[PDB]
Amino acid sequence: TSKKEMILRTAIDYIGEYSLETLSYDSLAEATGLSKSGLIYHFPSRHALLLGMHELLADDWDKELRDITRDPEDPLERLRAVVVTLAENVSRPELLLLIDAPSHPDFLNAWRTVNHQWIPDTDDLENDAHKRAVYLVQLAADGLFVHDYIHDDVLSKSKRQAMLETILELIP
Amino acid sequence: MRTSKKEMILRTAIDYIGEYSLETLSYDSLAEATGLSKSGLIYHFPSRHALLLGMHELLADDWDKELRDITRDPEDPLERLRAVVVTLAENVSRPELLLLIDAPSHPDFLNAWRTVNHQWIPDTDDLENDAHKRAVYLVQLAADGLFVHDYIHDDVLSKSKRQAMLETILELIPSELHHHH
Numbered sequence: 001t002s003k004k005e006m007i008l009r010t011a012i013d014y015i016g017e018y019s020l021e022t023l024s025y026d027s028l029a030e031a032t033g034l035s036k037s038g039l040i041y042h043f044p045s046r047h048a049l050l051l052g053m054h055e056l057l058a059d060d061w062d063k064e065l066r067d068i069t070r071d072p073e074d075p076l077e078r079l080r081a082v083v084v085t086l087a088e089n090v091s092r093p094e095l096l097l098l099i100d101a102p103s104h105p106d107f108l109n110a111w112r113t114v115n116h117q118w119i120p121d122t123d124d125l126e127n128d129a130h131k132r133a134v135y136l137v138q139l140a141a142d143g144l145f146v147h148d149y150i151h152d153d154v155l156s157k158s159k160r161q162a163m164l165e166t167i168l169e170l171i172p
Numbered sequence: 173m174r175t176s177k178k179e180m181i182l183r184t185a186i187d188y189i190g191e192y193s194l195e196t197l198s199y200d201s202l203a204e205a206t207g208l209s210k211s212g213l214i215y216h217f218p219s220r221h222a223l224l225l226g227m228h229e230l231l232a233d234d235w236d237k238e239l240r241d242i243t244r245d246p247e248d249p250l251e252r253l254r255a256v257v258v259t260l261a262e263n264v265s266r267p268e269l270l271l272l273i274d275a276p277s278h279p280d281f282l283n284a285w286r287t288v289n290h291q292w293i294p295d296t297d298d299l300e301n302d303a304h305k306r307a308v309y310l311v312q313l314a315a316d317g318l319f320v321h322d323y324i325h326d327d328v329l330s331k332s333k334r335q336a337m338l339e340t341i342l343e344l345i346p347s348e349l350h351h352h353h
């Protein structure tokens with residue numbers, strides 16, 4: 001789409017294949033085919049680029065959730081949408097940015113709104129069994145999301161689906 | 173007696189990736205990081221691949237020792253699972269999580285982890301045909317989630333709330349107690 005979005009998408013793909021560390025105007029220019037002058041025109045600094053990458057992924061998720069949520073006002077339907085979107089294995093770039101987000105308050109802030117609107121709260125969690133039952137679903141969904149990166153082997157398509165349905169049934 | 177720089181080399185290499193990356197981890201950068209000569213590194217790790225493999229094996233060993241140290245009965249699969257969940261009390265370090273997620277990059281790295289996981293993490297054999305098997309793996313999935321929680325969510329779980337969810341996951345483990353009408 002946008003030349004600007006093209007740059008961001010290319011940078012995201014880049015860190016998954018190489019690393020966040022070597023993402024530079026030199027490597028991004030080679031990857032996009034644009035000159036450094038052309039890159040600066042849209043992203044003044046590496047910080048601006050990284051921030052743009054975080055905001056893009058956060059926006060992607062928000063749009064995905066809004067797109068499949070029955071009633072955005074119903075907590076249980078939002079939870080279902082979260083489970084469904086997290087049921088697909090996370091990509092390397094997104095997992096890397098998620099883990100690196102705390103490197104700067106700006107990156108964390110990029111994910112703040114989507115987190116606040118879709119992730120369940122933990123108010124009085126220690127004394128609310130229903131609160132814990134709901135968060136337990138979030139936890140299992142998170143596990144399915146990263147499963148293939150933290151286990152010595154991946155889930156087959158059928159087994160992943162079987163577990164998705166299992167998590168869905170765990171919803172109160 | 174006599175000791176070596178092997179463990180320090182591995183620990184330094186692991187921390188290196190948290191500050192930089194696996195991509196730039198080389199004999200040159202590791203030499204600078206450890207303060208040792210490239211010859212001193214080569215002594216224990218003849219190839220970069222051997223270094224990476226050694227890093228994965230060290231972490232897998234750390235965990236195995238942690239589990240066996242907390243395991244109540246290494247004979248019962250649900251007892252091994254409880255041990256796995258108990259280890260969630262404290263977050264792993266970012267560099268260690270970063271190394272783990274790169275294991276899929278090579279069969280040897282994956283293999284370094286199976287050696288320990290096969291002894292503690294539930295398998296998925298007959299998953300689609302055993303409702304109990306799915307209930308057991310649901311626990312594993314929840315454990316997987318708590319493991320990465322503070323790294324993928326922006327709202328960190330307080331110590332008390334983390335402990336509460338840890339217990340909630342423990343509650344999810346299928347009962348081994350038979351009732352009487």
Ligand SMILES: CC[n+]1c(-c2ccccc2)c2cc(N)ccc2c2ccc(N)cc21
Binds near residue numbers: 151231268319
């Ligand atoms: C095998 C990866 N790994 C490690 C781990 C072990 C050694 C170094 C780094 C991470 C782990 C460490 C602690 N404390 C608690 C839970 C887990 C865990 C939980 C689930 C899973 N599927 C993999 C897990």
